RNA sequence: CCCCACUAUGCUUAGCCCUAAACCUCAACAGUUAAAUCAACAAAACUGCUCGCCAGAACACUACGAGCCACAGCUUAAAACUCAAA
């Protein structure tokens, strides 16, 4: 357990958990808000909202 | 000698067409939002082209395309519906701009 | 009466009903080439219909020949057969992304 | 009826296979048989190991035979089979050609079931 | 156990890859459904419990079949609204 | 030639090799995923035992047996005995869902083994013998 | 309840036993979609005709009698006492 001996080891293990980091912070901006490929839930029901199911008459 | 509903629509180019599936028709754009263009094509409901990627500032209000029919109204009836769903809108594949 | 009045008859526009790619044709126990277009190759699992695209008489027909081509000593079990696995790809499925 | 005879024999030289077909074919004519036609599908690979008769066979001969027989002469040419030791495996099915195919239409389309719920509100 | 050995359920690795090779013989045995049957083999499911899963199971092919086509068919009306102040 | 995933079949004419080795000559690893423990053999083509480890012969006990790491630790000491022996390349041939399955392909390929192929053999019975009884949690 | 082991039992043969939420709790046959469409829910509302069955709850898949290869069984099946509800 001599930091002095794992330096690569070490600082790989750094870099990468920085990168992940980051990545973690874009992961929010855009998959959450872009809402990309398929539309979200709430985005969807308002479009279910213009064509509801019509199970009776009128 | 007053012509009867029965002989105009006997008459009429959209009963002559018979089915739209994959008929080329006129239509005349009269209104625009954004790419998205509406056009009549002499039909109940208007269609909804997205504006092509090539010469797109040609399609303006007024400009008259060539079109490929699918279909006149889409509907479709889903699961519980005791009548069909109706987006009022044709359904056609704009082909390009109609040159004189 | 009035000569412009509709007149009753048939869809002269109707469209011949679809036909599955077997349709007409004899489906043997013997013919494990054809046989072999409807198994995975990986497992020898048999495609269900909304895979092969036959219809249910022939889905039936395809079944029951498997069934005994396998049993009768023509036909493998567990795997296609490799030299059937360059034959047409008739059914629709994917393993590969 | 007319019947069709899946036979499967052991991988051997063509004096003994040509042996083994002539005490077959005599047989179903001893049971009353009308034998029709002969058909050779070649040797190959078993699609599976098959034991039979105290041997393990990885390849083998298929042969076809195409007969007339009396409803009771295929039990008795069952038995027969299962003690003949040059065959792996041996079946009697009714000829596929007897059954006529009937004509097809096409694919008749199914609407969506309506009305399988009243039209009250909920 | 009678049948020829490394045909059946094999994938080729691929320059070393052997992470995609197992994603994609992970993705086989899960298309035909080898997966979930030997799942639900660990312990015995009685006939009638395997008939009412069944039955669950069709009722939300059924269901979830219908809805996402209605969500294709609807999908070209989530454009801009064409008449906005009216 | 484009890649191909189906594996070559004996007594036909491949072009693939492996150190001169053709596809039917390789050693296998059988792996063995339960789910309380994991087995790995690795034998020759012609079924000679090169090398055996498991979650049991590497030091662990009960629930520590059932885990991924532990897969991994024995998949190492099965490449490490197989690797003293000459092997390079082998074929996997994995059996069980258990939590150990892709855990210990890991660990061969840490102790040195190119794995040129995956086989899946989990044994599924076509209808067989019936299974102990439902569990009540 | 969880883990392990193992038996009757699940299988075959020959006889019994005759039960089930044996319920799709919706009787068979014929016909209708118009009128008043319809308590509620459930799986829309009805007509003709026939057989079976039902009449507060509990006592009671009980007692007694009778029948049955059934002997701790099955089928048929009450009453008294009790309550103003169920
Ligand atoms: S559609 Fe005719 S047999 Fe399939
Ligand atoms: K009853
Ligand atoms: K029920
Ligand atoms: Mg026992
Ligand atoms: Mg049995
Ligand atoms: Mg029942
Ligand atoms: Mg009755
Ligand atoms: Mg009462
Ligand atoms: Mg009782
Ligand atoms: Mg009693
Ligand atoms: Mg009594």
Redesign the interface.
């Known amino acids: 357990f001599r930091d002095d001996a794992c330096r690569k080891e070490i600082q790989g293990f750094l870099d990468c958990a920085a990168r992940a980091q980051e990545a973690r912070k874009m992961r929010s901006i855009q998959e959450t808000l872009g809402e990309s490929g398929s539309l979200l839930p709430n985005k969807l029901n308002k479009l279910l909202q213009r ?1 509801p ?5 009128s | 000698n007053v012509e ?1 509903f ?2 105009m ?2 008459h009429s180019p959209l009963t002559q067409m ?2 739209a599936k994959d008929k080329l028709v006129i239509g005349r754009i009269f ?1 625009i ?2 790419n ?1 263009l ?1 056009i009549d094509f002499g039909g109940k409901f208007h269609c ?1 082209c997205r504006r092509p990627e090539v010469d797109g500032e040609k399609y303006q209000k007024g400009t008259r395309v060539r079109l490929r029919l699918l279909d006149l109204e ?1 509907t ?8 069909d ?1 109706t ?1 009022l809108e044709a359904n056609a594949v704009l082909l390009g701009i109609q040159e004189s | 009466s ?1 000569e ?3 007149i009753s008859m048939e869809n002269p ?1 109707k469209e011949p009903l679809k036909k599955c790619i077997l349709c007409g044709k004899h489906v043997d126990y013997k013919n494990v080439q054809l046989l072999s277009q409807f198994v995975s190759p990986f497992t020898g699992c048999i495609y269900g219909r909304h895979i092969t695209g036959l219809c249910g008489k022939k889905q039936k027909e395809i079944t029951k020949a498997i069934k005994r081509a396998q049993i009768m000593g023509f036909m493998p079990v567990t795997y296609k057969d490799p030299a059937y696995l360059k034959d047409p790809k008739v059914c629709n499925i994917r393993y590969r992304e | 009826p007319r019947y069709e005879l899946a036979l499967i024999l052991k991988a051997m030289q063509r004096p003994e296979t040509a042996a083994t077909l002539k005490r077959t074919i005599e047989a179903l004519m001893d049971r009353g048989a009308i034998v029709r036609d002969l058909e050779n599908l070649g040797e190959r690979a078993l699609p599976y190991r098959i034991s039979a008769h105290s041997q393990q066979h990885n390849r083998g001969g298929y042969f076809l035979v195409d007969f007339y027989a009396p409803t009771a002469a295929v039990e008795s040419m069952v038995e027969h089979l299962s003690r003949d030791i040059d065959v792996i495996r041996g079946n009697i099915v009714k000829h596929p050609l007897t059954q006529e195919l009937k004509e097809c239409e096409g694919i008749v389309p199914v609407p ?1 079931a ?1 009305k ?2 009243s ?1 009250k509100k909920r | 156990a009678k049948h020829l050995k490394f045909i059946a359920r094999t994938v080729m690795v691929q320059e070393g890859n052997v992470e995609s090779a197992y994603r994609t013989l992970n993705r086989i045995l899960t298309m035909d459904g080898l997966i979930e049957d030997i799942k639900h083999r660990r312990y015995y499911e009685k006939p009638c419990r395997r008939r009412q899963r069944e039955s669950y199971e069709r009722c939300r092919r ?2 979830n079949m ?2 996402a ?2 969500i294709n ?2 999908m ?2 989530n ?4 008449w906005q102040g009216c | 030639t484009k890649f191909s995933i189906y594996p070559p079949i004996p007594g036909e004419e491949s072009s693939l090799r492996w150190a001169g080795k053709k596809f039917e000559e390789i050693p296998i690893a059988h792996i063995k995923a339960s789910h309380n423990n994991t087995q790995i053999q690795v034998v020759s083509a012609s079924n000679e035992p090169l090398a055996f480890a498991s979650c049991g012969t590497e030091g662990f006990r009960n629930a520590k047996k059932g885990t991924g790491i532990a897969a991994q630790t024995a998949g190492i000491a099965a490449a490490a005995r197989a690797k003293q022996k000459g092997v390079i390349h082998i074929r996997v041939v994995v059996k069980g869902l258990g939590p150990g399955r892709l855990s210990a392909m890991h660990g061969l390929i840490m102790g040195g083994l190119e794995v040129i192929s995956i086989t899946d053999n989990t044994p599924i019975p076509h209808x067989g013998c019936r299974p102990r009884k439902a569990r009540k949690l």
């Open positions: 064509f199911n019509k199970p009776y008459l | 009867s029965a002989s629509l006997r018979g089915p209104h939002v954004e998205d509406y909804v889409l479709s009836r889903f699961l519980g519906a005791t009548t769903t987006v | 009035n412009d009045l509709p526009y | 969506l309506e399988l719920y039209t | 059924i269901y219908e809805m086509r209605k068919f609807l070209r009306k454009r801009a609204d064409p």
